[PDB]
Design a protein around this ligand. Structure first.
Ligand code: CA
Ligand code: CA
Ligand code: CL
Ligand code: CL
Lengths: 333, 327
């Protein structure tokens, strides 16, 4: 049994967390504010102009692998100035505040409705920047190697296509693409033992079928089926998910904690624990258990430097029930 | 991989740790001192008279299940005054100090050589007190139901044989006995999911980890190693070339075993279910600190370990015998 304790509340859709080496904590609020929680006080680290409609705005957040030597905080945001699109930007760290440094990758698909913008970013064991993107409700983008939408991208911290990427030599293909065939993926997590990448993504919603949200084991160049395939199939061209909920469980981020894979649930309003059995390249879920419930919609989930599991609530994202002090950062054990 | 940091040092054979709900930490030093480490300061909580020779002295330590409302600290110790034997004594908690309340269980075997005195005590998920005892180098005692030696005992916090014990209605058997056929057992840990009790003990090599079941006979000294005799329970894990273990604890999904002569903390990756467990693989989680004896998960989620380099069988180094904290 995991014990919960509230770290801080009153936040508006805390999409991602970043743990500063000195103990502080950066919190990305979808409306466009990056908050700093330190010594029991909440302050504004930075304010960024964003397009906050639908599921868009200020989404993923990640510190440079060599932070603070390389004083840089990365953020994924939907912007409208000069044209509506998603992008990954970088801010220069000044201690208690951050200021826009430059755009790292621009032109990721976005639409006026603000739906399916993806947004999860994180630096992997290889030191590269991984970025999830949605197909903005134009499902065919996911299968289009020429589109940055419905993909998982991999870049160097400077924004260049990562060396060794799967489509580096092909004409008509975006060299930034790591994997394709993804609807709206928002999770990124690496298995501590194998280094394998796992991702979570929302399945169809009266959008070609209901439920079938999933957790995928991401391999370089892998095509995860959307929109050609929903759930599992017999087609070897498209990789089946490690697990999927035929009755839908729309997922937030996911993280490895104590040998198990935890998945934050948004509509399901719960934190699920996936018990795995297998080895590199051969995993399967033995059983699924509820690790947390009674706190509403859950979106971000990360293991902190203290070894504790941090989770954020999403009750104020327009699809939940807002209650006093809502949208907290919770610490489990 | 785990990351370590020293909590405090300069200790003399810190045998067991007890975490105070308020934040403090009690440390049992074999020579007979219970220390209090609170807000960065080390002090003496209590000083008990003990017989500290061989592997004996002040050994296991455990707070009452309802501490501090039930202000009581349990300690296992070898005493010479009034006769040489091992016992579980209770102290009244007074804040920064603890004083002698009463003996909870007396008469556990002890011998002048001070070897094989067991000593690990802990309250289980059932709220009962579990006590490990050695056969004081008189191996036959382990198979003798009339002897408190070479056993794991289970009592109520008041010292009465725990209700439901396996040999309650057995002529010629100490009602306190929970399991028998131990050689020297100084390890107690319960699986977080199943509530099953796991124990570690020293054998000639043949050190092992056992899944303790009520009434189980663990073979010493009739059988060592695995076999398939319904009378005896096989060990969960057996060390062919011999790791002498300290305590063990479940941490972040795995079972960790402190190694004394092995000078390392081993991680046992388990696979199976309630009643049928097996060790998938064994890995080293910590080393470079010498002999390791106590291992317990703290309230802060970190795994605590103690060194035992000053117990007479290791290499002592400046500041040696510390309490370490892992991630
Ligand atoms: Ca799929
Ligand atoms: Ca045995
Ligand atoms: Cl969303
Ligand atoms: Cl010993």
């Amino acid at each position: 049994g995991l014990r919960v304790e509230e770290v801080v509340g009153g936040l508006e859709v805390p999409w991602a967390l970043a743990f500063l080496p000195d103990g502080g904590m950066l919190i990305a609020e979808r409306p466009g504010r990056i908050r700093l929680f330190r010594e029991g006080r909440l302050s504004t680290y930075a304010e960024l102009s964003v397009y906050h409609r639908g599921e868009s705005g200020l989404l993923g957040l990640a510190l440079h692998p060599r932070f603070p030597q390389e004083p840089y905080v990365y953020a994924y945001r939907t912007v409208a100035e000069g044209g509506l699109r998603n992008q990954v930007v970088r801010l220069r760290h000044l201690g208690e505040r951050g200021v826009l440094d430059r755009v790292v990758l621009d032109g990721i698909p976005a639409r006026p409705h603000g739906l399916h913008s993806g947004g999860r970013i994180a630096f992997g064991p290889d030191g590269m920047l991984y970025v999830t993107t949605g197909e903005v409700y134009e499902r065919e983008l996911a299968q289009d190697l020429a589109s940055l939408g419905g993909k998982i991208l991999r870049l160097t911290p400077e924004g260049e296509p990562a060396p060794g990427n799967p489509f580096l030599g092909r004409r008509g293909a975006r060299p930034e693409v790591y994997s394709l065939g993804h609807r709206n993926p928002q999770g990124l997590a690496w298995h501590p033992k194998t280094g394998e990448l796992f991702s979570s993504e929302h399945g169809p919603s009266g959008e070609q079928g209901y439920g079938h949200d999933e957790v995928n084991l991401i391999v370089p160049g892998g095509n995860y089926g959307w929109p050609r395939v929903v759930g599992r199939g017999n087609d070897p061209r498209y990789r089946d998910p490690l697990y999927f909920w035929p009755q839908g469980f729309p997922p937030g981020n996911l993280a490895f904690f104590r040998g198990d894979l935890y998945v934050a649930g948004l509509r399901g309003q719960a934190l699920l624990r996936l018990v795995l059995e297998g080895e590199r390249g051969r995993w399967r879920v033995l059983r699924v258990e509820t690790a947390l419930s009674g706190f509403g919609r859950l979106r971000e989930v990360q293991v902190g430097p203290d070894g504790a599991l941090y989770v954020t609530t999403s009750n104020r994202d327009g699809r939940g029930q807002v209650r006093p002090g809502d949208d907290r950062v919770l610490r489990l054990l």
